[PDB]
């Protein structure tokens, strides 16, 4: 079946303990970090439910290395295109993360440096949502270059029910080192936030990506076409209305590319 | 032995048809282009023999989906920061479109922001990371705008070593070089009758190891040391699911 078998590559768990699921995520955090000899984490954070939950858990992480006699650093940073509307639940979670660092580098003159020059380079203006991934590939870069200032990896927030949508950019938030949230759905996310103690405007605020201009704060929902209860469902092996697996099957398969390193010859995934 | 693993997982022939290799390889390209409903490709031309074997690659390939009465088209794009050789590759390979974005004014803009916001100035490998992930969004945007996909220059003897950037030139759509070695790269070239300037531990020591030839304890050890370092570079991001990284 593809239900199943999506739930098998996705990771999911239809049933999980918030408590253990934590325990996992910040030990799976702390080995990585030991193994490699890095000194810590760097993670964009938005104000949305997914980068206060693997921001969190990153803090935490840090916290046990140096409880152990450990050396490990957190810096947060936020990567506004300008001024960013919900700004404010931006600082409501830097306030619920509390991480050791807190930055800021604004990706607005980077993006129009690359839009005026593409411009005058082809004749053809962007596309806003062209430009909308050149700003998330834009914070990947600005990420990176903390990260490799400062010794540290750089954090992904890519979960499950984004994972069976591909709804994400290549190498733009697609583009980290370790992933914490991989294989919680998104009502299980908000679970742990809860866990967490976190905010509930935080978890209860409507998902978006944010990358338009022509229309910000764009919801998740208005763009894929399904809600985020029915992909849960799916994702946790519930049974749907036929409507809701074809339809998410179909995006699964169209998006293969997303989940997978550059295709070779010898690759079958895409044949 | 992690000699023959490493041929294995790297795709390496230990003897190549360069003739049947260029076909293969052509045919991989117009397969992939029509499965996914692609109009064509992009490839950052640098004068460099790997992203002029590809570039030519891309070309007889798209001819020959025209040919076949198809819709197909190759964008090659210079990416300088602010010549002679990407130029002569030119006059090789022969693309629909020859294109480029100077990446200078982009690279520049996010230094002084990063300057202005840090404190600090970016060192030099920094820096270079930035130019090779700003040459990636570059291709991508391209692409982006005209439903091409963007072809990536990655070969066993630059994945042996990790020698690239994660996102930067490593950051394509697909890779039409994968399994070949420097010096079969080279043999490639020459049989599409490409000019000698363009395709030309030791090197040839990389291409003895991948191609399983009998190599001294030294360039063996080290190699290995290198690939399991580099890992990471041809893995999707890791998670507590993945073990490869342990
Ligand atoms: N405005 C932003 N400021 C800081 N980080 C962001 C911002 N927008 C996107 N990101 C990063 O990209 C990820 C994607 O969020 P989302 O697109 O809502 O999944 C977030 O979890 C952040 O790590
Ligand atoms: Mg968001």
């Given at each position: 079946?593809?239900?199943?078998?999506?739930?098998?590559?996705?990771?999911?768990?239809?049933?999980?303990?918030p408590?253990?699921?934590?325990?996992?995520?910040?030990?799976?955090?702390?080995?990585?970090?030991?193994?490699?000899?890095?000194?810590?984490?760097?993670?964009?954070?938005?104000?949305?439910q997914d980068?206060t939950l693997?921001?969190?858990?990153?803090?935490?992480?840090?916290?046990?290395?140096?409880?152990?006699?450990?050396?490990?650093?957190?810096?947060?940073?936020?990567?506004?295109?300008?001024?960013?509307?919900?700004?404010?639940?931006?600082?409501?979670?830097?306030?619920?993360?509390?991480?050791?660092?807190?930055?800021?580098?604004?990706?607005?003159?980077?993006?129009?440096?690359?839009?005026?020059?593409?411009?005058?380079?082809?004749?053809?203006?962007?596309?806003?949502?062209?430009?909308?991934?050149?700003?998330?590939?834009?914070?990947?870069?600005?990420?990176?270059?903390?990260?490799?200032?400062?010794?540290?990896?750089?954090?992904?927030?890519?979960?499950?029910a984004?994972?069976?949508?591909?709804?994400?950019?290549?190498?733009?938030?697609?583009?980290?080192?370790?992933?914490?949230?991989?294989?919680l759905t998104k009502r299980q996310g908000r679970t742990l936030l809860k866990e967490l103690?976190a905010?509930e405007?935080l978890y209860l605020?409507?998902?978006?990506?944010?990358?338009?201009?022509?229309?910000?704060?764009?919801?998740?929902?208005?763009?894929?076409?399904?809600?985020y209860?029915?992909?849960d469902?799916?994702?946790?092996?519930?049974?749907?209305?036929?409507?809701?697996?074809?339809?998410?099957?179909?995006?699964?398969?169209?998006?293969?590319?997303?989940?997978?390193?550059?295709?070779?010859?010898?690759?079958?995934?895409?044949?």
């Amino acid at each position: 079946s593809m239900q199943e078998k999506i739930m098998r590559e996705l990771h999911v768990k239809p049933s999980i303990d918030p408590k253990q699921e934590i325990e996992d995520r910040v030990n799976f955090l702390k080995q990585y970090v030991k193994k490699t000899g890095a000194k810590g984490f760097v993670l964009g954070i938005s104000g949305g439910q997914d980068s206060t939950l693997a921001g969190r858990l990153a803090q935490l992480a840090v916290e046990s290395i140096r409880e152990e006699g450990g050396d490990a650093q957190f810096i947060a940073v936020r990567l506004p295109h300008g001024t960013q509307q919900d700004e404010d639940d931006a600082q409501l979670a830097l306030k619920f993360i509390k991480p050791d660092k807190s930055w800021k580098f604004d990706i607005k003159s980077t993006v129009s440096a690359f839009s005026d020059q593409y411009q005058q380079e082809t004749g053809d203006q962007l596309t806003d949502f062209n430009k909308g991934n050149v700003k998330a590939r834009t914070r990947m870069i600005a990420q990176y270059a903390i990260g490799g200032q400062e010794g540290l990896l750089v954090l992904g927030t890519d979960h499950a029910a984004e994972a069976v949508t591909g709804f994400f950019t290549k190498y733009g938030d697609g583009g980290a080192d370790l992933l914490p949230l991989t294989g919680l759905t998104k009502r299980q996310g908000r679970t742990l936030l809860k866990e967490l103690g976190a905010p509930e405007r935080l978890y209860l605020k409507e998902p978006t990506a944010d990358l338009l201009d022509e229309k910000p704060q764009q919801s998740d929902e208005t763009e894929l076409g399904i809600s985020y209860d029915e992909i849960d469902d799916y994702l946790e092996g519930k049974e749907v209305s036929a409507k809701v697996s074809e339809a998410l099957e179909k995006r699964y398969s169209m998006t293969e590319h997303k989940r997978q390193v550059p295709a070779s010859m010898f690759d079958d995934w895409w044949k």
